[PDB]
């Protein structure tokens, strides 16, 4: 009795869709065609006789995506009309899929979104993924928020965006979207996770030892974090966390919920199994600055709290025999006015493996949910990154012929100046 | 900051107000010592504790890592107190190119003192206000 | 006669449960499937204390299970020995309080309390002659220390002749596994202290040292913490079922316990404790069974009893044995120890003897002793508390439901009342 | 418990280890592939000491690999047992040092010692109890001499109070590879006296003229050396891996041959050592060990015992004789050499006997004795530093790098200084 | 209802115990598991059913000989947490065992000692085993005689210290650290009897006939003098001695309490029986003296009291008759104020024999404790041992680094000359 409905909107979105729904139907043993050859309930439902039908929704605009997934193995999955998909693409445009093309597909949207949550009776709350640095799906993301938080009010939402990498890039206008984008969702959403993809390049490369990676190995990562948050739900635990028990808990003050993860061990079958991989070692790997999933460093910041997801045969005084030295150490230091500042849940579960994939199978693994006051230096480097090109304002008249107004850009870049003061302001000493 | 060679008066002067600081490690050649910049991390954090977080300067030997430190400091320290470090400077100090440290040190010290001089104007301006506030607030 | 009901919430509240009564009915050699299959006449004749008689001579306990979600309780009917529970006595919510104290107290906890004071009211006015409730809750998180709490309240206000009980786990701050604990603790404690007759702390961090240090078992799981505690809850009661020289209900402990009303927080112990390889080379006697009993260790708190001196202690001795013995190790206990005992009030330790000793051991004890170390508890859980409040952080989540900080500052300027009130008697002298 | 870690450098280095850790696995029972085969209860009870424990069953020892150019360690890798090491301990540089002091120490050292040392600090931060470290290093290179050195002091300077082992070996001026060997010998031996905690110098002369005469084997390579290098270091560490009469760890060494903190370089050997032909002829016994332990020929260094004398002395015994025996010899070769042992501190000599032989063997002696003759090796190496020095050849190399002259004056100054506070004790009399 | 605690402490001290723990089961009948298949009570306790637990207590700070004792056949008699081991050895260091590591182990050991005492009723004193020449050894027990004098006070307490050997010696540095436990136990025990190496191994070599004796053919002597002299406590005699009997009789002056002991008769089953080794001829031998027990020439010196025991079936008007012819020889001198020196004990148990040992069955044996002036001769050479080193203060550094003081090593000095002027003092006749 207990649901939650995810919201897949642009490439990106979609393309990190399939890859955890891929794992949801190997991990709860449903084949790709819906049919089992009682805690499935969380993500399906069941139809009545036989097959699972997944409680996820797919947006995008260019249609090309959404025809790949309708005719691979995952066809007879997904219900034909949930699919939804437009004709034009925004192209990289902000103000196009949130002022002229959006508006016309947001409706389908949202009367299937009614349809999916009348249908659940225990509704925890909704997920959505979207790639912040395109037009599509920045627009489309921020005026669903924007349509939700007003439809349903307190229940909710939990944002997986994935910001630009500091230097590399692979657009040129990314900048502009992606501050607006945080302009809309940052009043908006109750948490959003940090997910760029430099970050995640360099933990592939060192810890998998892949040279060329491609965009699915990144993407299964971000699964198995997904299936780590939420498989408390699902399973029976010594320890257990509820998704609405998270503001109380990681988000100090109403404006501050942005926060970076990481995740352990990572390794792979070839020599996983020379070491013991015991709880104190990955909880030690899950706390080095260079295994935080988003590019910030740990280490020019103070910590606020954190909120770190075990699961396997893990004991619990092992875990607080391993916060213990965590304490210990020097070069952690958490914020003055937080005197203990972790949350432990403990899951019985091991991870899944996927057929083909690059993790190997392990009886332990840690997944830790922090939040501290070094995230704002990717505002700050987005911040300069604007700065340069709207002080001539260059590229401002793709934007402003699509509806939008010459002064919107301007309260995005005092939004964002009271974010960092606020940060700022937060971790001094008292 | 292309300032003169400094003359052995300054050099001394320069070194005797370092050894007058309780620093974590004992000093044997100034130059080596701080190319890392974490002793000058220590330096002003001794004045100014808290505008310098010490724990973001780890010692390094490695060229990267000097060169991370002392471009931290250099962003979020040295701008605060109204100076700045060129690149090519902070290359010659990573190096422990001779003098390169030295020259640092000195333009440091006069921007540290004048920085002290301005945090006490500035408590001193705020406390002769709120006093002056609490005089007005006793005649309402 | 003079039999209990038995009312739990919360998680950790149910996992205690289902230890307890497994203990019992195991005590009682009561199947899983609630038929008495037992050796000795005395095992039914005082079963009307905690079991019901249903028809086909079955028996079902009395206890009463509420939580905000139904996990736990959907979890523990599968566990052994969970059919006994009577399946109208499950009472449960679709929501969650997320550890929000405010919400399990003010908005979710105060409409649902309604159907389980039904039941509750139902089960006392039928039984023969009360004698008063037991409540097992936890400090730590939000819907039990706000419901059950709040449910103390009611109770007291219904039934303030008769006695009430309750075991609480405080948050300790070694093992963190919350980190809005301080904030749901503080608020709970001055509740707490208006209306329960009597409460016992009990820490995990205290159970853990306990496991490793005495038992020196290698990997300590919530079964072993639940079990110790169950031992404990358990020994309490014990003469109050079977014969003994000396009976001594619940009552006769209250009035001998509490020398002032607002000083019913006790610290407890159970002994004997030995390891698996060691259990052949102790002998069980008397003085064995004493030095044990007032071990630092063995206290089930993290609190030092050498930190204070004793208002008063009490002793339940079970199996047969020598009274003469008993009476002078008891005081040979105060004679040497005359500097941790309070002076102006002299021959302040308790003993009673039970004739019936646990399943498997010959001899046991079970130790409540008030003394002024609790001091400590309080004193580091008001220090985060005040750390964390001066900056208002995570304050947000529990003004937004009705609640304001005025509540805060009372709870804590009780708390601190409590905390300098239970000390002024440690430096009293005569 | 009391255990070491391994960390070698240098070409010259990982050879040694290559056979260190093939003796210690053949001693243990380890083969190639981490799974022990062995026979005896002892062979597994303190494997704590040099290996670690993974999944599998497995063991892999705790050793760190370091060398500034890849060949040798993508060399070690395909020799026999070179399974056994962990490839994330393999750190090495693009560049080498080219038998350049100063870039091994200034220039490419500097930078690389970062990740080296994280391994290292991974390693010892981890272990049980530390007891210290072991170093294998050649004097004779650039790199090895240099980064070694370097990593020393920064090890010395995070754990002031383990004890540190270094061997080393000495450039000889009879069997000359290198052009620039005394430049880095006269430098590495400033740094390696303030901060080595024990010292033992190995000379390649000294190990042909062994193999040559007794021995009398007609072609000697490396292999050999480092045979016989490597049981010299196994014999050092036996009685701390296994059960004796008289247990004397390193520290207790440490104490008994350490007059004052700068005497500190010993010169060993190992015995019994006899030709494949004459190995039946001779009779094993406590005589016929101790006649050899002394032999002047016998020293693993090219310095003559018999022109000075010792300050103290030290030998291990292995296998199962009677302790009589042991101290009426060893008073024996002290009352007939008294010309050679100084006078004013009596019983100068230390025994130890450990009840486990080496395998094939039934009997051994490992010496370790500090005298008073090692002065001729810096004699000799400051001989030849001065009259390359005093021209200025091949000082350009050194000085572009950043290094000066002055330190080499310095170097050289404090190298004699050593030298003549080391013979000051000599002719001390009483 | 008469009872007697015996401490092991540093390897020497193990090695005895463990040779004096056969002898005593032995010779009470009692198993090697502790089973047997009223005259225990003196050395053991009774459990209630079945197995007897010693009244000893290992300590080491190394652990391979508690581990080597726990694995024996002997892993069954002792309690499993009265052995109490350390990780990191003092490696002879006298100062590390005083004031750096023995500090954090000695509150376990006054523990146990307590939990040993409150057992005993009828306590009659303390034995206490220690190698003089170690670091743990003689720091340890210097550390737990302070604790005891000032925890318990009167009770006595007696040490079978092992000093060093005139020449043969085993370390370097024993001179240092035999002189500072001198200093501490002349001030603090009751009695100290001699126990070195050298006369112990002529003693075999003469009489036994061992060409290559071990330290097991050592201590089973010693065992077999602790038994003689404590068999008058356990076992009939016609005339007793009890412990508390020997400061009113052995001990003129508080100072004065070293004395040296011998054994006869001596012999091997081989030539035993040709001789009848009557009474006359075996207290002969006993006052012989190249029998003596510690390297001391008796002839040096006077007598100042004798104390020896008798056991087996000898007769009170023999031993009267052997007395005289003794006071008749000129060879043996007593001192001018004592008359009559003797002091008599008969008992009916003969000496017991140790399968597979050197000693053979007799019915008469004679054990003495005699009380010399000839003793200060070992005071003399190990004060001039000590002046030698000490005059350049050599292996201080390893002391100063420890804790200790520089002045702390003049005072055990002039502690050493005050007690051999004493000596000088009272030899004087009148
Ligand atoms: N992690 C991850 N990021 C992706 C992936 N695909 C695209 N992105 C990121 O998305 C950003 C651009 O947005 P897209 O998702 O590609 O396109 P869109 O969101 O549909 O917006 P439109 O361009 O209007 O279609 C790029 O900067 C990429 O970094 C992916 O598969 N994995
Ligand atoms: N009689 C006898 N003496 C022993 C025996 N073992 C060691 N010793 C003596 O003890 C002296 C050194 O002290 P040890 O007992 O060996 O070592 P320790 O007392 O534990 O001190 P540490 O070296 O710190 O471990 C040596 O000089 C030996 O003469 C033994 O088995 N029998
Ligand atoms: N003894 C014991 N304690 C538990 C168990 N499960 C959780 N806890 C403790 O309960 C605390 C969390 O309480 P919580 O589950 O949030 O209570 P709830 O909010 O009423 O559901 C943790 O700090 C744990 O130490 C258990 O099975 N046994
Ligand atoms: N025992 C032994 N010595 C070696 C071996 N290889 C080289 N050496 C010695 O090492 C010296 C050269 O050291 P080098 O290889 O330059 O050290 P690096 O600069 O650290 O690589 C020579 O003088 C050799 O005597 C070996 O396999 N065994
Ligand atoms: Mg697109
Ligand atoms: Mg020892």
Not at chain 1, 352 to 363: C, H, R, S
Not at chain 3, 67 to 92: H, I, K, W, Y
């Amino acid at each position: 009795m207990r649901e939650v409905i995810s919201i897949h909107v642009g490439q990106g979105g979609i393309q990190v869709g399939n890859a955890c729904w891929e794992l949801f139907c190997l991990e709860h043993g449903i084949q790709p065609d819906g049919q089992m050859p009682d805690a499935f309930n969380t993500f399906f439902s069941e139809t009545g006789a036989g097959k699972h039908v997944p409680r996820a929704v797919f947006l995008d605009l260019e249609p090309t995506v959404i025809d790949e997934v309708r005719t691979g193995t995952y066809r007879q999955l997904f219900h034909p009309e949930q699919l939804i998909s437009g004709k034009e693409d925004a192209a990289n445009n902000f103000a196009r899929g949130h002022y002229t093309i959006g508006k016309e597909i947001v409706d389908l949207c949202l009367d299937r979104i009614r349809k999916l949550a009348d249908n659940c009776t225990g509704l925890q709350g909704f997920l959505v993924f979207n790639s912040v640095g395109g037009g599509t799906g920045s627009g489309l993301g921020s005026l669903l928020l924007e349509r939700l938080s007003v439809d349903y009010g307190k229940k909710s939402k939990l944002g997986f965006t994935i910001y630009p990498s500091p230097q590399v890039s692979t657009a040129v206008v990314e900048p502009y979207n992606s501050i607006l984008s945080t302009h809309s969702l940052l009043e908006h959403t109750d948490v959003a996770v940090m997910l760029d993809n430099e970050a995640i390049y360099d933990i592939c490369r060192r810890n998998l030892d892949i040279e060329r990676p491609t965009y699915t190995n990144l993407n299964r990562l971000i699964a198995q974090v997904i299936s780590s948050l939420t498989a408390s739900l699902r399973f029976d635990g010594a320890l257990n966390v509820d998704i609405t028990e998270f503001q109380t808990n990681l988000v100090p003050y109403p404006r501050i919920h942005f926060m970076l993860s990481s995740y352990a061990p990572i390794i792979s079958a070839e020599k996983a199994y020379h070491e013991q991989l015991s709880v104190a070692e990955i909880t030690n790997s899950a706390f080095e600055p260079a295994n935080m999933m988003a590019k910030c460093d740990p280490r020019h910041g103070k910590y606020m709290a954190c909120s770190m997801m075990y699961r396997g045969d893990v004991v619990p005084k092992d875990v607080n025999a391993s916060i213990a030295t965590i304490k210990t150490k020097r070069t952690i230091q958490f914020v003055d006015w937080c005197p203990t500042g972790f949350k432990v849940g403990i899951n019985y579960q091991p991870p899944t493996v996927v057929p083909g994939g690059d993790l190997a199978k392990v009886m332990r693994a840690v997944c830790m949910i922090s939040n501290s006051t070094a995230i704002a230096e990717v505002f700050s480097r987005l911040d300069h990154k604007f700065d340069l090109m709207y002080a001539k304002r260059a590229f401002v008249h793709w934007y402003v012929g699509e509806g939008m107004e010459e002064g919107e850009f301007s309260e995005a870049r005092e939004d964002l100046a009271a974010l960092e003061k606020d940060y700022e302001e937060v971790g001094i000493e008292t | 900051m292309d300032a003169p060679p400094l003359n052995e008066e300054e050099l001394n002067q320069i070194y005797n107000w370092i050894d007058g600081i309780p620093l974590s490690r004992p000093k044997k050649n100034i130059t080596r010592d701080f190319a890392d910049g974490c002793m000058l991390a220590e330096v002003i954090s001794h004045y100014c504790p808290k505008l310098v977080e010490v724990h973001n300067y780890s010692q390094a030997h490695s060229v990267t890592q000097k060169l991370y430190n002392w471009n931290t400091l250099n962003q979020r320290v040295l701008k605060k107190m109204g100076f700045q470090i060129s690149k090519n400077d902070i290359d010659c100090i990573i190096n422990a190119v001779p003098d390169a440290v030295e020259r640092v040190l000195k333009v440091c010290q006069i921007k540290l003192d004048k920085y002290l001089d301005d945090q006490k104007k500035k408590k001193d301006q705020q406390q002769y206000i709120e006093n002056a506030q609490m005089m007005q607030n006793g005649n309402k | 006669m003079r039999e209990i009901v038995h009312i739990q919430g919360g998680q950790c509240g149910n996992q205690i449960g289902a230890k307890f009564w497994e203990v019992i009915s195991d005590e009682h050699g009561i199947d899983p499937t609630g038929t008495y299959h037992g050796d000795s006449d005395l095992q039914l004749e005082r079963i009307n204390v905690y079991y019901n008689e249903a028809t086909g001579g079955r028996y079902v306990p009395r206890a009463i299970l509420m939580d905000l979600e139904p996990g736990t309780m959907d979890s523990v009917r599968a566990g052994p020995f969970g059919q006994l529970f009577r399946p109208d006595n499950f009472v449960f919510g679709q929501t969650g309080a997320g550890n929000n104290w405010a919400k399990g107290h003010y908005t979710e906890g105060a409409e649902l309390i309604d159907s389980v004071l039904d039941v509750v009211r139902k089960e006392a006015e039928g039984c023969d002659c009360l004698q008063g409730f037991q409540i097992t809750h936890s400090l730590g998180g939000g819907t039990g220390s706000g419901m059950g709490t709040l449910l103390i309240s009611k109770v007291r206000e219904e039934y303030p002749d008769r006695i009430m009980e309750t075991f609480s786990v405080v948050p300790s701050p070694k093992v963190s596994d919350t980190v809005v604990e301080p904030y749901n603790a503080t608020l709970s404690v001055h509740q707490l202290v208006e209306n329960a007759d009597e409460c016992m702390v009990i820490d995990n961090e205290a159970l853990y040292d306990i496991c490793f240090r005495t038992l020196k078992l290698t990997t300590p799981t919530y079964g072993d913490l639940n079990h110790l505690v169950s031992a404990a809850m358990s020994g309490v009661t014990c003469c109050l079922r079977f014969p003994g020289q000396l009976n001594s209900d619940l009552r006769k402990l209250a009035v001998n316990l509490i020398p002032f009303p607002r000083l019913h927080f006790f610290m407890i112990g159970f002994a004997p404790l030995t390891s698996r390889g060691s259990q052949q080379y102790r002998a069980l006697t008397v003085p064995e069974l004493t030095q044990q009993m007032f071990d630092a260790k063995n206290m089930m708190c993290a609190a030092d009893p050498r930190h204070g001196r004793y208002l008063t202690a009490s002793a339940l001795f079970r199996g047969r044995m020598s009274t003469k013995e008993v009476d002078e190790q008891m005081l040979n206990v105060q004679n040497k120890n005359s500097s941790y005992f309070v002076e102006w009030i002299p021959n302040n330790i308790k003993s009673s003897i039970c004739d019936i000793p646990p399943k498997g051991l010959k001899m046991a004890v079970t130790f409540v002793g008030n003394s002024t170390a609790i001091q400590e508890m309080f004193k580091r859980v008001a220090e985060q508390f005040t750390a964390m409040f001066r900056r208002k952080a995570f304050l947000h989540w529990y003004t937004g439901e009705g609640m304001d900080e005025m509540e805060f500052t009372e709870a804590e300027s009780n708390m601190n009342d409590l905390v300098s009130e239970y000390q002024q008697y440690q430096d009293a002298t005569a």
